[PDB]
Amino acid sequence: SWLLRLFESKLFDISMAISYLYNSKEPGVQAYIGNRLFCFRNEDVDFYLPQLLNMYIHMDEDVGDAIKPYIVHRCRQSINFSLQCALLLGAYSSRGTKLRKLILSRLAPEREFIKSLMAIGKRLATLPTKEQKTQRLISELSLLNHKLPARVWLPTAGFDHHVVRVPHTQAVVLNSKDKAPYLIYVEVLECENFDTTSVPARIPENVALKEPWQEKVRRIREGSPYGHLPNWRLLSVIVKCGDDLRQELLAFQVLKQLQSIWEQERVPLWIKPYKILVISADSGMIEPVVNAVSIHQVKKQSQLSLLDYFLQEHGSYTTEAFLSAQRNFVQSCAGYCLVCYLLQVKDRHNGNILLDAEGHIIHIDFGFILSFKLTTEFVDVMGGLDGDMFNYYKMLMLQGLIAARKHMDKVVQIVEIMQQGSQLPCFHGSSTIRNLKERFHMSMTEEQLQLLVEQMVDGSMRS
Amino acid sequence: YDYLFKVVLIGDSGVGKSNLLSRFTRNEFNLESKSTIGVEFATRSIQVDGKTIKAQIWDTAITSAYYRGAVGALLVYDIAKHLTYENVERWLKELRDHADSNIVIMLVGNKSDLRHLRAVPTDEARAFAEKNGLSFIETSALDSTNVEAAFQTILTEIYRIVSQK
Ligand SMILES: CC[C@H](CO)NS(=O)(=O)c1cc(-c2c(C)nc3c(NCCNC(C)=O)cc(Cl)nn23)ccc1OC
Ligand SMILES: Nc1nc2c(ncn2[C@@H]2O[C@H](COP(=O)(O)OP(=O)(O)OP(O)(O)=S)[C@@H](O)[C@H]2O)c(=O)[nH]1
Numbered sequence: 001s002w003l004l005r006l007f008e009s010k011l012f013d014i015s016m017a018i019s020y021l022y023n024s025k026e027p028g029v030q031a032y033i034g035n036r037l038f039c040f041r042n043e044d045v046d047f048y049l050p051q052l053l054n055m056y057i058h059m060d061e062d063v064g065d066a067i068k069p070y071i072v073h074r075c076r077q078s079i080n081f082s083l084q085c086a087l088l089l090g091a092y093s094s095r096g097t098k099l100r101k102l103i104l105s106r107l108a109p110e111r112e113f114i115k116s117l118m119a120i121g122k123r124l125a126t127l128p129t130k131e132q133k134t135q136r137l138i139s140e141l142s143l144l145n146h147k148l149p150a151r152v153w154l155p156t157a158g159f160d161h162h163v164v165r166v167p168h169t170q171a172v173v174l175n176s177k178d179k180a181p182y183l184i185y186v187e188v189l190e191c192e193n194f195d196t197t198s199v200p201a202r203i204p205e206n207v208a209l210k211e212p213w214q215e216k217v218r219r220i221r222e223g224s225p226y227g228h229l230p231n232w233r234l235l236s237v238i239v240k241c242g243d244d245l246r247q248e249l250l251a252f253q254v255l256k257q258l259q260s261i262w263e264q265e266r267v268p269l270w271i272k273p274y275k276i277l278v279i280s281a282d283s284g285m286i287e288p289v290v291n292a293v294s295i296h297q298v299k300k301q302s303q304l305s306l307l308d309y310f311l312q313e314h315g316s317y318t319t320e321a322f323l324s325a326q327r328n329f330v331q332s333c334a335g336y337c338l339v340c341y342l343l344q345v346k347d348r349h350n351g352n353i354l355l356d357a358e359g360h361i362i363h364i365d366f367g368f369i370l371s372f373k374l375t376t377e378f379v380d381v382m383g384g385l386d387g388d389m390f391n392y393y394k395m396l397m398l399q400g401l402i403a404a405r406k407h408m409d410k411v412v413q414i415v416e417i418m419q420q421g422s423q424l425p426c427f428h429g430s431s432t433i434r435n436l437k438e439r440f441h442m443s444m445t446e447e448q449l450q451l452l453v454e455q456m457v458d459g460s461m462r463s
Numbered sequence: 464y465d466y467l468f469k470v471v472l473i474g475d476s477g478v479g480k481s482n483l484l485s486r487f488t489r490n491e492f493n494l495e496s497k498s499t500i501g502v503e504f505a506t507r508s509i510q511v512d513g514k515t516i517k518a519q520i521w522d523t524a525i526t527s528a529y530y531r532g533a534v535g536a537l538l539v540y541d542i543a544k545h546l547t548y549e550n551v552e553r554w555l556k557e558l559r560d561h562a563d564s565n566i567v568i569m570l571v572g573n574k575s576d577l578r579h580l581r582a583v584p585t586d587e588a589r590a591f592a593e594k595n596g597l598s599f600i601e602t603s604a605l606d607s608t609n610v611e612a613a614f615q616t617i618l619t620e621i622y623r624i625v626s627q628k
Contacts, residue, residue: 003493004492007494026494026495026496027477027496028495028496031574031580035576035579035580065544066580069579
């Protein structure tokens with residue numbers, strides 16, 4: 001009854017459930033939890049879908065039969081859920097297959113919609129320059145409006161909706177690589193429920209420049225057939241036709257949890273997880289952060305040092321706009337340094353860090369993790385090594401570390417389960433989780449942590 | 464004091480024979496499960512029509528063969544695992560052969576609490592249930608549902624054997 005005692009308390013959450021599910025070999029417990037999933041809010045359980053489906057694939061049949069019923073139930077009341085399952089089921093197996101076909105079994109429109117989009121990306125491969133790729137993209141995207149009214153949606157959107165229009169003239173390709181990813185803007189009409197509504201009616205078709213996000217919506221709205229409607233909103237996704245996003249997804253969950261941990265405790269670090277979508281385990285989509293551009297390009301257009309740009313874009317240090325931006329900088333630095341450390345990110349450079357209009361930084365590329373540098377340019381923005389704001393940066397890191405230790409298992413859980421039958425490059429070591437746990441230094445005293453943080457920063461400065 | 468009833472619990476492994484007994488005999492339950500190795504009894508006395516009886520329940524390495532002189536049998540299956548229901552036919556064939564040819568039998572669907580994971584409908588079971596000379600309650604050992612009722616059905620069922628001159 002001691003187990004059952006716990007499970008019937010308020011203490012029981014989806015986190016706990018999966019942990020016992022992953023470890024417990026008692027089928028009586030497994031089945032009990034399988035059933036208890038239904039009582040939880042749809043929203044809480046969703047976050048763990050990548051874990052659940054991985055278990056289904058790679059674990060004993062016993063575990064699967066306990067899991068399957070809940071999945072099917074969700075699938076029947078949400079095609080979005082159905083979609084994401086099918087995509088995930090496939091990517092993580094190269095047991096799974098039997099269930100995927102049953103789920104794909106109506107939903108036909110969406111799978112072609114996605115396939116077309118990648119097929120586009122693969123096509124840009126024969127065109128060797130960035131600019132050339134972009135021209136073909138816009139043209140070929142224009143062909144999508146012909147089926148544009150559609151009855152399809154972006155799973156990456158916070159909500160249910162129909163895609164109505166692609167402002168093809170506004171789309172752009174992001175690099176010159178052979179299988180370069182490309183960013184597109186998409187118009188949608190919000191729904192209350194996708195599964196229960198009409199597809200909207202077509203509204204017939206009748207410039208592109210560098211601009212902030214809210215100004216870009218205005219311009220597009222005024223130009224859009226559907227723009228007058230209150231139902232109308234603009235979304236955006238980046239398309240990766242030949243790159244795996246499974247490592248990327250793993251990082252996202254970790255970022256989201258750390259974000260919540262620091263939220264529950266009262267540590268004012270700042271970070272920005274960006275939604276990830278996995279299509280094939282070769283291909284994916286990303287929901288982009290708006291109002292941000294790489295440090296490197298920021299340095300090529302300005303010809304300035306980072307601090308000077310801050311001063312240019314916000315004001316003299318006697319202004320609110322600057323001091324606020326500075327605060328936002330420092331808080332975002334500590335957050336991402338800890339994330340880089342905890343996940344042991346590597347290959348950190350100004351191509352992988354974005355700057356938003358309020359001053360936060362945002363690391364964006366999470367290849368090369370598991371199995372961050374402080375350049376003097378960064379330290380300058382903080383007011384220098386002796387600065388109070390720089391000291392505060394160190395203070396936040398400690399605070400955020402003390403908070404993180406208090407919730408270590410929530411984090412490791414997310415990661416430890418994904419190693420399960422995994423052929424990802426980040427899991428090469430037997431160690432890998434074991435080393436990860438050591439990096440929380442759970443044994444250490446706070447005095448020890450104060451010292452370790454100082455040392456970390458000094459190391460981070462050598463370059 | 465007045466009568467001694469030999470009852471067996473039989474069924475596939477995992478169906479909940481041992482937890483029914485722990486609920487029914489000691490009002491204790493556990494999710495953690497030590498397999499029953501061979502045989503258990505536990506005992507509890509009840510009163511029917513103002514008469515003191517005593518039920519001796521035996522839980523159950525195939526050869527238990529403990530049936531003999533076994534007047535009643537609770538045959539249990541897990542409602543959430545269809546296969547456990549499938550072997551009920553094979554559990555009634557081996558019944559007759561190594562066990563009394565006129566024993567009182569009640570069929571039991573256990574783990575009724577797993578509403579959303581339910582894999583065996585009450586009607587299909589109860590259909591087979593009334594099609595043949597078996598009893599048919601559904602229980603949950605975990606949330607102490609129908610557990611007393613199940614026993615007291617078979618015991619009352621059992622009692623009505625008086626067959627006097
Ligand atoms: C795009 C994927 C390609 C490979 O397939 N690699 S990538 O381009 O380097 C890259 C960019 C981003 C990203 C995000 C979440 N948000 C913006 C973003 N936001 C700005 C967009 N909007 C405005 C108004 O500036 C801009 C850019 Cl360049 N990237 N980005 C995320 C991951 C990522 O993969 C490492
Ligand atoms: N939700 C729910 N789970 C149950 C119930 N009864 C048993 N379980 C689970 O079934 C399993 C039964 O294990 P056990 O204690 O050995 O009983 P058994 O059915 O007799 O197993 P055996 O025949 O191999 S001895 C346990 O994990 C137990 O938690 C029930 O009534 N409701």
